[PDB]
């Protein structure tokens, strides 16, 4: 039986868009049906990297499962996690992606972040994350308490450091900020390490699967 996404797309579903809330997944499917491009699936404007390839590897899976890669109540103690935005509202109440956490400063500080995950699920683990780009420099310091920010994502088959670029932009869905979404596949036994001092849209929920 195919994965039925109903009135929303693959981007909003895999990210946990509050309008695709509920929409319980399955363990297996041979194809996906969807209504594409409701504001390109991202309630917060941005760029989805390698989006065509992700859809290709999500076409046919056999052992799909959604788990918590970094629990909210731990993992991020010295940071605040309850960040929401009006662009991602649910029932007229501001919310955020059910699978990501907009980490910002807690008690005025954003300490050096470092969290790792080992793929002990004996399958491939799909990890989604993001990087945020404020529109002015004043808001960058108020949100992350740093003018120069880095986000390090390191695994055995993936390694990249993102530097946020601050620039003025038009209002897309009422927002002048952007969030670029990235992902990578973690083979069984591999370790992925997230290091950051700001602008990280940290992974909250991930996915383990086969045939992908």
């Amino acid at each position, epitope marked *: 039986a195919p994965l039925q996404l109903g009135n929303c797309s693959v981007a909003g579903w895999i990210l946990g868009n509050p309008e695709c809330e509920s929409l319980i997944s399955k363990e297996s499917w041979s194809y996906i049906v969807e209504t594409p491009n409701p504001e390109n699936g991202t309630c917060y404007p941005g760029y989805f990297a390698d989006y065509e390839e992700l859809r290709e590897q999500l076409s046919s899976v056999s052992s799909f499962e959604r788990f918590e890669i970094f629990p909210k109540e731990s993992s991020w103690p010295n940071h605040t996690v309850t960040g929401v935005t009006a662009s991602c509202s649910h029932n007229g109440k501001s919310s955020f992606y059910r699978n990501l956490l907009w980490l910002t400063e807690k*008690n*005025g500080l954003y300490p050096n972040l470092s969290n790792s995950y080992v793929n002990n699920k004996e399958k491939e683990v799909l990890v989604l994350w993001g990087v945020h780009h404020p529109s002015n420099i004043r*808001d960058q310091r*108020a949100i992350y308490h740093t003018e120069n920010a880095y986000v390090s994502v390191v695994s055995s088959h993936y390694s990249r450091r993102f530097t946020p670029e601050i620039a003025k932009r038009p209002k897309v869905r009422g*927002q*002048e900020g952007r969030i670029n979404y990235y992902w990578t596949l973690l083979e069984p036994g591999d370790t992925i390490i997230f290091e950051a001092n700001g602008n990280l849209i940290a992974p909250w929920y991930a996915f383990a699967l086969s045939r992908g």
Partner: antibody
Amino acid sequence: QVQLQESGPGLVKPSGTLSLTCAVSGGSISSSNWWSWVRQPPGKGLEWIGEIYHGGSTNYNPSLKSRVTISVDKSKNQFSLKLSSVTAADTAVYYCARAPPYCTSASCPDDYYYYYMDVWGKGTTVTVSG
Amino acid sequence: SELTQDPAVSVALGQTVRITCQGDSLRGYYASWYQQKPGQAPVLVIYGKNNRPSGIPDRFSGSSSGNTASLTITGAQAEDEADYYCNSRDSSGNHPVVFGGGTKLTVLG
């Protein structure tokens, strides 16, 4: 979490300079926070004095801008207030408070567009007299 | 500009009262409300849209409409007698902070 405690003279001579100190505990003064001052003349309403963000950024009341100086000292984990050319109008209970950071663009979470002062000191009574 | 509020209002205990604050700075940023008992420091009771800090009873609710912000106290009690101040940051210029004149609430009965 963070706690604030004012300290300073309760008496300042007319035409003199008021000088107050607020000690921050349970937190770093060099943080994303607007450390603020508020005063209250006897039987009168609250009056906002000014605020500071580490890096030298200060924002003062327009009616007080000429006589007000708010600084910060990282070594002692404290921020101060100095008001010059004091008169009877400056007799008041002075509070030091904490205001959260805020944004001026639509690129921040919703909680960064609220203004408030949640952490208040206990208050220091200053009397302008000879 | 400035925030104006009536200096005094009364409510019979058990009933509801609405403390209104008006100004040109209320459309830019959200208003916050404080409660000041005699001889004590102000305590924040409402910030944002309708968010109350931890330890503030649900009897306090806050709504805004245009250039007007309101604090509603449902089921007033004797402990609610205090001075109430509105407070907001201006969305123009260097963003100065302005306080309302304050409202003295008297609980009757």
